[PDB]
Symmetry: C3
Subunit: 40 residues, 3 copies
């Protein structure tokens, strides 16, 4: 129905909420690969 | 057209599919920064 | 209004732009957990 149409919009805000907090956590993991392990 | 309108909804389900499997993989990388390298 | 309706579509393309570049960066961090630290 109509309400659900606009309700998919809030579900869409939810989807962007997931990507934003994933970029959030990612900020830490972002500076994780720069000094990795190597050699023997 | 109309069909494409609803087809953009399946495309949005695709977008959430990407973020969900990215959070999936992330679960592993999520416990990656806690014991990083350091010192000299 | 109508314009804003379609404007939410471009905002939606923005959302997929975030997840695509996050998968981009993630490709590097993806091969980060395979040789982590361990032991004493």
């Amino acid at each position: 129905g109509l309400p659900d149409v606009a309700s998919l919009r809030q579900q869409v805000e939810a989807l962007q909420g997931q990507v934003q907090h994933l970029q959030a956590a990612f900020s830490q993991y972002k500076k994780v690969e720069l000094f990795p392990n190597g050699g023997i």
